[PDB]
Amino acid sequence: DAFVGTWKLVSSENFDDYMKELGVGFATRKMGGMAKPNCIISVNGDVITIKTESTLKNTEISFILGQEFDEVTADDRKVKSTITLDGGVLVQVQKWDGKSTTIKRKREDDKLVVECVMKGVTCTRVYERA
Ligand SMILES: O=C(N[C@H]1CCCC[C@H]1C(=O)O)c1ccc(Cl)c(Cl)c1
C-alpha cells in the first residue's frame, strides 16, 4: 500500500539505548547497531509479510491485522505480537514477561519511518526505497 516495497535503512537515532532497555547484551548490540538492513514488505490479501535482511541476521514475520501471533525477535526474545492499522500507521506491540514494546511504522513523504518505544526510550529509524 503505502508500505509495500523494498526499503533500505538510511538513518537511526537512539537504537543502542533502545536495545539496552530491551535487555540486549553488549555483543548483540554491537552487531545490531552497525547493521544496515533492508526491510521488504509485501501483502497477499489478509496476510502481510515483513522481511528484514542484513549481513548478519535475517528475520521474517507474517501476520493478519488484529490477530496475535508468536514471534522470535532478532535478539531472541519470545514474544506475543499484535499488529493493527491506526490512521494509516502500522502499530505493533510485543509482549513478553509482563513487559511490552511498541513499533510504529509510518509513511512520510518518500520514506518509511519506524518509531520504537521501550519504557523511557524512543528510537527512530528511517528507510528509503531501495
Ligand atoms: O528486528 C529488527 N528491527 C525492527 C524491530 C525493532 C526495531 C525496529 C525495526 C527496525 O530495525 O526497523 C532487526 C532485525 C535484524 C537486524 Cl540486523 C536489526 Cl539491526 C534489526
UniProtKB/Swiss-Prot annotation:
One Gene Ontology term from the biological process aspect of the record: brown fat cell differentiation
UniProt keyword terms in alphabetical order: Acetylation, Cytoplasm, Lipid-binding, Nucleus, Phosphoprotein, Transport
Major localization listed first in the record, in broad terms: cytoplasm
Phosphoserine PTM sites in chain numbering: S11
Database matches in InterPro entries: Calycin, Fatty_acid-bd, ILBP, Lipocln_cytosolic_FA-bd_dom
PROSITE patterns noted in UniProt: FABP
Binding site for a fatty acid: R125, V126, Y127
Pfam families per UniProt: Lipocalin (PF00061)
Subcellular location: Cytoplasm; Nucleus
Entry annotated with the keyword RNA-binding: no
GO CC entries: cytoplasm; cytosol; extracellular exosome; lipid droplet; nucleus
One Gene Ontology molecular-function label: long-chain fatty acid binding
Modified residues (Phosphotyrosine): Y18
Claim: Phosphoprotein is one of the keywords in the record: yes
Sequence motif: Nuclear localization signal, positions: 20-30
Domain note: Forms a beta-barrel structure that accommodates hydrophobic ligands in its interior.
Subunit structure: Monomer. Homodimer. Interacts with PPARG.
Family: Belongs to the calycin superfamily. Fatty-acid binding protein (FABP) family.
Biological role: Lipid transport protein in adipocytes. Binds both long chain fatty acids and retinoic acid. Delivers long-chain fatty acids and retinoic acid to their cognate receptors in the nucleus.
Name of the molecule in the record: Fatty acid-binding protein, adipocyte
Organism annotation: Homo sapiens (Human)
UniProt gene name: FABP4
